[PDB]
C-alpha cells in the first residue's frame, strides 16, 4: 500500500482516450457528410484531432517507457501479447476480403459472362510490375531482419543503414503500386472484379503506409538513442507488423493477381 510492490504500470489519467473517441465520431459522421451533403470540413477536423491524439498518446507511451522506466519485464510481456492479438484481428479483417474474392471468382454469375475474369476486363500481368512489387516487399523482409540483428549486436550505424534501406523499399512499393492504379485499365466501378481488386489491394496499400510511418518513427527513435540492444519493443512490433504486410501481399499476389486473372 502507498508504495506498490508489483512490477506493473499504473498509467496517469489521460485525456487521449476521450480525444480519440471524439475523433472517431468526427471522422465517421464526417464521412457521412462527404458522402451525402458533400462536405469535408467535418472529415478534415476529425483527421486532424485524430493525428493529434495518436501523436500525443504515443509520445506519452515513449515518455513512460524510455524516460520514466515503467516498462519492466512483466509490462513488456503484456505488450507482446497485445501486438500479437492485434495482428490477429487484422488477419481476420483481410479474410473477409479474400472470402469475397474467392466467392466471386469461383462461381462467376451470368451477368459477368459466366466466366472469370469477367468479359470486358483486361487483368494486369502478374509477371510485370506485380512481380516487381513482390520482390521489393520480400527484400525489405530480409533487410528489416538485418536491422534487427544489428540492433541486438549494438551496431548503431548498421541498424540505421538497414532500417533506411527497408523504409525506401516500402516507399518504392507505394509509388509503384500508385502508378499501377493510375495505369490500370479497370476501376472500382468495374463490377465485382474491380471492387474485389481495389478494396483488397487498397486496404493492403493503406497498411503499407501505416507500416512505413511506423518504421520511420522507429528510425528517429534510434537516431535519438531510445533503443538499447535489449529493450526495443517499439521495433519488435514495427517488425512484426511489417511481416504481416509482406505475407498479406503474398496472398494477394497469388490469389488476385495470378490465380484470379
Amino acid at each position: 500500500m502507498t508504495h506498490q510492490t508489483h512490477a506493473y504500470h499504473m498509467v496517469n489519467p489521460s485525456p487521449w482516450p476521450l480525444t480519440g473517441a471524439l475523433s472517431a465520431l468526427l471522422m465517421t459522421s464526417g464521412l457521412t457528410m462527404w458522402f451525402h451533403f458533400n462536405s469535408m470540413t467535418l472529415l478534415m477536423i476529425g483527421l486532424t484531432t485524430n493525428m493529434l491524439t495518436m501523436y500525443q498518446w504515443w509520445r506519452d507511451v515513449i515518455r513512460e517507457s524510455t524516460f520514466q522506466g515503467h516498462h519492466t519485464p512483466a509490462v513488456q510481456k503484456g505488450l507482446r501479447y497485445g501486438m500479437i492479438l492485434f495482428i490477429i484481428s487484422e488477419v481476420l479483417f483481410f479474410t473477409g476480403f479474400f472470402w469475397a474474392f474467392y466467392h466471386s471468382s469461383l462461381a462467376p454469375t451470368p451477368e459477368l459472362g459466366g466466366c472469370w475474369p469477367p468479359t470486358g476486363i483486361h487483368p494486369l500481368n502478374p509477371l510485370e510490375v506485380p512481380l516487381l512489387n513482390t520482390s521489393v516487399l520480400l527484400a525489405s523482409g530480409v533487410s528489416i531482419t538485418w536491422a534487427h540483428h544489428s540492433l541486438m549486436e549494438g551496431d548503431r550505424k548498421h541498424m540505421l543503414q538497414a532500417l533506411f534501406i527497408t523504409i525506401t523499399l516500402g516507399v518504392y512499393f507505394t509509388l509503384l503500386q500508385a502508378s499501377e492504379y493510375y495505369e490500370a485499365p479497370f476501376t472500382i466501378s468495374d463490377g465485382v472484379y474491380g471492387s474485389t481488386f481495389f478494396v483488397a489491394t487498397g486496404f493492403h496499400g493503406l497498411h503499407v503506409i501505416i507500416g512505413s510511418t511506423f518504421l520511420i518513427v522507429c528510425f528517429f527513435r534510434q537516431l535519438k538513442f531510445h533503443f538499447t540492444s535489449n529493450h526495443h519493443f517499439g521495433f519488435e512490433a514495427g517488425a512484426w507488423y511489417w511481416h504481416f504486410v509482406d505475407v498479406v501481399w503474398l496472398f494477394l499476389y497469388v490469389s488476385i493477381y495470378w490465380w484470379g486473372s
Binding site: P13, T32, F35, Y81, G82, L92, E111
Partner: protein
C-alpha cells in the same frame, strides 16, 4: 477532479461503473422500443404505420439491447469490475486503451440515434441485409450511420477483447495456473477470443456494404456480378459467435451465483465446465449457415450445418447438469440472486431446446422467418442473458456500492418479471407454428388472441423495470452499509471490503508454489 476521475480514468473499477451506467440507460431505450413493438401488435390493425416506421423500431430495438445494453453491462461492467479483483491484479494491462473502449460507445450510440432521425431511418432488420439496405431501397444517410455506429462499437469491443486476454493471461499471481482462475474469468477470457475473431469479419462485411452504396462497388449487386448471399455469409460468420459472446459471461456469473448460494466452496466439475465453454466457443464458429436454410444451398451442405449445430447441445448439457450437481448437497439460501439463477437454468434450457428444433433444416423450412424463432431467442436473451445480468447485479451490487438492496423488494421484482416475460414470449411459439411471419406490423385476424396476450405480458415487464429503478434509488436513499460477507475464503472479489478501494492489490497477493 471530476474530469480527471470520470473522463480521464485509468481505473478498472471506475471504467466498469461507467459501463454499468451506460448499459442501464441504453436498457431504458431498448425497453421503450420493445413496447412500441408490442403496442403496434396488441390489436389487429396499424398504430404507427407502414412496415418502415415499424421496422425502424424493430431494428433499433435489436441494436440497442445487443450492442448497448447486454455487451456493455456483462463485459465492460462486470468484466472490468470483477476480473482484476478475481485474479488479484492491480488493474488491467492497458488502463488507457480500456478507457477508449468505453468512450467509443456513447458516440457509437449517437450515430445509431441519428440514423433513425434523418430521412426515414433504417428499416432493414438488425441483419441490415442488401438489397434492402442498399442505396436504392434505402437511399440516404440512415444505413450509413447505422454502419458507422457498428464500426465504432466493433473497434470498442476488440480493443477490450485485447485488454482482457492480455490481463487474464499475463497478470495472475506467479503461482496460479489458468486452471486455478475462477469460471467467470475463464468465461470472459473465452468471450474475448470470440470477439477478437468474429468482429473483424463483420467489419469486413459492412465496409463492403458501405462501398457498394457510396463508392459504386458491386460486392452484393448481381448487376456487377455480386451476390446478396455473400453478405449473409460474412454477417452470419460473426452473427453466430455473437450470440455466444452474449451468453458466455452469463454462464460464468451463473456458476458463481449458484455455487455461492449453495454454500459450496467450488462448482461441481470445474474442468468439465472449462471444457464445456471452450467447446461451445469453438463449435460456435463452424455453424453460421443454419441461419440460411431457405436461401437455396446444396442439400449436402444443408445437412452438414444441421448436424454441426446439434453437437453444441452436448457441452451445453454438461454445464446445465453441472449447475444442478452444484446445488446438490448445498445449504441453499433463497436470495434474490439465487432466484434469478434458477430461472435462468430452466428458461435457458427451454429456449435452447427450442433452438435444437430449429437446428433441423427440413423443419426450419417451415419455421424460419416466423415467430417461433422470435420465441427461441427471447427465451435465451430475455430470460437467459438478462436473468444472469439481474442475478449478477443483485449479487454484486454491495461490492460495487458498499450499500445493500432491500431483498423483499428485490424478490417482488423477480416475481413480476418472471410472469411478464413468460406471458410475453410463450404464446409466440404458437403464432410461429401457425405461420405468423417476423417483421410484420399487422397480421391476419386469426393471430389476434396470442398477439394480445403477448402484448399484455410486455406491460407487466414494463412495470418490473420501473420498480427496479426505484429499488436502486431506495438502496442509495437508505444507506445500509455492508458489514459482513460469507464465504470470502473462496471469493476474492469481496476480500477488500465493500466497496474496494480505488487502488487494490497495491502490494500483490502471496501465493505459494507448492
Amino acid at each position: 477532479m471530476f474530469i480527471n476521475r470520470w473522463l480521464f480514468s485509468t481505473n478498472h473499477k471506475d471504467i466498469g461503473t461507467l459501463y454499468l451506467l451506460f448499459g442501464a440507460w441504453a436498457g431504458m431505450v431498448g425497453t421503450a422500443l420493445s413496447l412500441l413493438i408490442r403496442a403496434e401488435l396488441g390489436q389487429p390493425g396499424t398504430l404507427l404505420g407502414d412496415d418502415q416506421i415499424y421496422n425502424v423500431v424493430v431494428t433499433a430495438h435489436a441494436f440497442v439491447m445487443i450492442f448497448f445494453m447486454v455487451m456493455p453491462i456483462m463485459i465492460g461492467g462486470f468484466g472490468n469490475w470483477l476480473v482484476p479483483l478475481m485474479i488479484g491484479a492491480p488493474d488491467m494491462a492497458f488502463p488507457r486503451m480500456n478507457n477508449m473502449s468505453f468512450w467509443l460507445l456513447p458516440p457509437s450510440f449517437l450515430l445509431l440515434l441519428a440514423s433513425s432521425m434523418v430521412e426515414a431511418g433504417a428499416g432493414t432488420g438488425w441483419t441490415v441485409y442488401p438489397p434492402l439496405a442498399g442505396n436504392l431501397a434505402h437511399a440516404g444517410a440512415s444505413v450509413d450511420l447505422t454502419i458507422f455506429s457498428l464500426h465504432l462499437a466493433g473497434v470498442s469491443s476488440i480493443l477490450g477483447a485485447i485488454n482482457f486476454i492480455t490481463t487474464i493471461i499475463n497478470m495472475k499471481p506467479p503461482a496460479m495456473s489458468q486452471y486455478q482462475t475462477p469460471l467467470f474469468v475463464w468465461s470472459v477470457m473465452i468471450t474475448a477470443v470470440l470477439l477478437l475473431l468474429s468482429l473483424p469479419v463483420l467489419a469486413a462485411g459492412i465496409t463492403m456494404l458501405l462501398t457498394d452504396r457510396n463508392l459504386n462497388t458491386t460486392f452484393f449487386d448481381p448487376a456487377g456480378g455480386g451476390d446478396p448471399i455473400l453478405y449473409q455469409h460474412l454477417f452470419w460468420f460473426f452473427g453466430h459467435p455473437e450470440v455466444y459472446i452474449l451468453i458466455l459471461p452469463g454462464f460464468g456469473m451463473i456458476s458463481h451465483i449458484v455455487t455461492y448460494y449453495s454454500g459450496k466452496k467450488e462448482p461441481f466439475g470445474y474442468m468439465g465446465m472449462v471444457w464445456a465453454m471452450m467447446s461451445i466457443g469453438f463449435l460456435g464458429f463452424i455453424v453460421w449457415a443454419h441461419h440460411m436454410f431457405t436461401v437455396g444451398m446444396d442439400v449436402d451442405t444443408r445437412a452438414y450445418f444441421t448436424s454441426a449445430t446439434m453437437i453444441i447441445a452436448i457441452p451445453t448439457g454438461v454445464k446445465v447438469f453441472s449447475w444442478l450437481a452444484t446445488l446438490h448437497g448445498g445449504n441453499i439460501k433463497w436470495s434474490p440472486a439465487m432466484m434469478w439463477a434458477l430461472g435462468f437454468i430452466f428458461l435457458f434450457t427451454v429456449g435452447g431446446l427450442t433452438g435444437i428444433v430449429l437446428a433441423n433444416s427440413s423443419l426450419d423450412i417451415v419455421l424460419h422467418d416466423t415467430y417461433y424463432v422470435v420465441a427461441h431467442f427471447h427465451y435465451v436473451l430475455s430470460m437467459g442473458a438478462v436473468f444472469a445480468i439481474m442475478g449478477g447485479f443483485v449479487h454484486w451490487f454491495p461490492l460495487f456500492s458498499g450499500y445493500t438492496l432491500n431483498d423483499t423488494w428485490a424478490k417482488i421484482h423477480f416475481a413480476i418479471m418472471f410472469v411478464g416475460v413468460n406471458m410475453t414470449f410463450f404464446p409466440q411459439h404458437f403464432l410461429g407454428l401457425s405461420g405468423m411471419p417476423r417483421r410484420y406490423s399487422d397480421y391476419p385476424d386469426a393471430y389476434t388472441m396470442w398477439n394480445t396476450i403477448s402484448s399484455m405480458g410486455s406491460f407487466i415487464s414494463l412495470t418490473a423495470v420501473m420498480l427496479m429503478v426505484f429499488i436502486i434509488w431506495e438502496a442509495f436513499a437508505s444507506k445500509r452499509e455492508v458489514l459482513t460477507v460469507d464465504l470470502t475464503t473462496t471469493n476474492l472479489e469481496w476480500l477488500n471490503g465493500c466497496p474496494p478501494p480505488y487502488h487494490t492489490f497495491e502490494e500483490p497477493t502471496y501465493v505459494n508454489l507448492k
